[PDB]
Amino acid sequence: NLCPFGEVFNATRFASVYAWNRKRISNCVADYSVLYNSASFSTFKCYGVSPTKLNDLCFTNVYADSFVIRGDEVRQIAPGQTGKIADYNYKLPDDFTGCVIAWNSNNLDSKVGGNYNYLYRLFRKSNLKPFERDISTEIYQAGSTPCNGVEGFNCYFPLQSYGFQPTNGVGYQPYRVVVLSFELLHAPATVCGP
Amino acid sequence: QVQLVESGGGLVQAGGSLRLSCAVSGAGAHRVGWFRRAPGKEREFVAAIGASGGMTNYLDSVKGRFTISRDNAKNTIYLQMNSLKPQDTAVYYCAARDIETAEYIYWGQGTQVTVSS
Ligand SMILES: C[As](C)(=O)[O-]
Ligand SMILES: C[As](C)(=O)[O-]
C-alpha cells in the first residue's frame, strides 16, 4: 500500500505548536513526487537529504509532526535557531536529518473576528531538548517571589494566543507546518521509495 | 489602545448570585482575569480566562463558586459569582494582559460588591 498523504497534510485539524502531534509512518511505501509537484507550499526545505532524489531513497522509520504557527515563526523551525518558538515550544537538533514543510492557511485558519484557538508557549524554566513536548499548564515564576497561586507580578500563565485576521500581515498570518524526521536502525527494511 | 468598563456591582446578602460584566475597546487575543480589593490585603488575583475561552484559572479559596466565561462575538466577559461570603466583599476590577508582557497593563475602573451576614 501507499503512505498517508491526506491523513497528514490534507488533515482538517492541525494541533498547536506547543502540543504538536506525532505520526509514525512505518511499514509502507511513500512517493514524495506528488508533494513536490504541488505549488501550494510556501517553504519546502530539507536538511541532510536531497529534495528531488527523495523518491529513490529508503529509510527505516519516519516521524511526522503536525502543528501551526505564525508566518514569521516559520523561520525559527530550523536547527540551531533561537526565539520564543524554538526555545520553548518546538526545537530541532543540530544533527537533524529531515525536512521542513509549511504552507499558508490564512484562508482556512483565519476568522472574520479572528482565530484565537491556536496557542503558543512563551515562558519556561529551561529551554526544551530536541523533540521534547511539554504540555504542562503549571504557571511559572519569573521573579524571585514564590507564586503557589495564580497570575500576578512575575507569575504568569505560560501560553498565549494568535490573532489570525485575514487583514493581518503575512508575517502574522498562519502557516501549517509539517516536519519529517528520519531514522535508521540495524533493520532498515520497512520504508522505501517506488 | 485597550479600554475596559465594568458593570453589575452592588449589595448582596449571604448566599445568592452576582454576574459581573466587562466591556472591551476592540482588544483581541488577550488573557483576562479579575482582581478584587479586599480591605485586608487588596489587589489580588481572582479568576482567569483565555482569549479562546479555554485555559481557565481561579483561586483555591474560590474554586468552584465563581465561573468565568466570555463572548468574543459580543466583545464582553462575564464573571458568575455563587455562594457569596463576607470575605468576598470587595471592589472587583477587570484587567487585560498584553501579548508581549503578561503584566495586565490595560485596566478598568472597577465596581463594588458587599456581602453582609
Ligand atoms: C525559514 As522559511 C520561513 O523559508 O521555511
Ligand atoms: C490561553 As491565553 C494565556 O492565550 O488567553
Side-chain angles (χ1 to χ4, degrees), chain A residues 129-139 141-179:
Chain A
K129 294 184 176 182
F131 291 171
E132 187 191 353
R133 181 146 52 79
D134 166 270
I135 202 189
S136 62
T137 325
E138 300 176 350
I139 55 100
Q141 60 302 348
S144 48
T145 68
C147 310
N148 297 342
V150 200
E151 298 156 57
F153 204 72
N154 287 333
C155 250
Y156 307 146
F157 188 76
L159 283 62
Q160 187 42 54
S161 68
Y162 299 128
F164 290 157
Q165 294 180 336
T167 59
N168 270 348
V170 193
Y172 300 149
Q173 280 173 31
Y175 280 87
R176 299 176 163 188
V177 181
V178 192
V179 169

Side-chain angles (χ1 to χ4, degrees), chain A residues 1-30 32-35 37-72 74-139 141-184 186-194:
Chain A
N1 64 88
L2 302 181
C3 285
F5 153 65
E7 299 190 17
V8 186
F9 287 78
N10 289 335
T12 311
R13 293 182 183 174
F14 266 154
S16 197
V17 52
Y18 66 97
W20 48 277
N21 290 340
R22 310 233 72 169
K23 182 58 186 306
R24 173 177 63 91
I25 316 166
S26 300
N27 294 334
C28 60
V29 177
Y32 307 84
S33 300
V34 287
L35 302 185
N37 286 27
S38 46
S40 47
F41 300 109
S42 161
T43 44
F44 186 69
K45 62 180 68 180
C46 273
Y47 292 86
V49 195
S50 57
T52 311
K53 302 312 292 172
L54 286 172
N55 203 29
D56 293 320
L57 182 55
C58 308
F59 286 101
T60 301
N61 296 314
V62 184
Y63 292 108
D65 305 335
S66 308
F67 55 95
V68 170
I69 58 184
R70 209 197 303 185
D72 287 341
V74 188
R75 304 185 310 187
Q76 295 204 15
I77 312 297
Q81 289 297 112
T82 186
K84 298 165 183 176
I85 300 298
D87 302 339
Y88 307 124
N89 297 259
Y90 189 64
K91 185 55 178 176
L92 293 176
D94 183 75
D95 63 278
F96 172 70
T97 61
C99 294
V100 164
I101 301 173
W103 64 96
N104 182 264
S105 68
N106 172 66
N107 310 335
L108 308 186
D109 288 332
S110 175
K111 297 181 188 174
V112 181
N115 190 337
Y116 308 97
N117 293 281
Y118 290 112
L119 314 177
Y120 65 98
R121 175 70 61 95
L122 267 181
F123 295 99
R124 192 177 196 278
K125 55 173 181 62
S126 58
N127 299 31
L128 285 177
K129 294 184 176 182
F131 291 171
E132 187 191 353
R133 181 146 52 79
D134 166 270
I135 202 189
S136 62
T137 325
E138 300 176 350
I139 55 100
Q141 60 302 348
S144 48
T145 68
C147 310
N148 297 342
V150 200
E151 298 156 57
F153 204 72
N154 287 333
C155 250
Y156 307 146
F157 188 76
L159 283 62
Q160 187 42 54
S161 68
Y162 299 128
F164 290 157
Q165 294 180 336
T167 59
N168 270 348
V170 193
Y172 300 149
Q173 280 173 31
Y175 280 87
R176 299 176 163 188
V177 181
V178 192
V179 169
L180 309 167
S181 63
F182 306 101
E183 187 179 4
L184 284 143
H186 299 72
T190 40
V191 180
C192 191

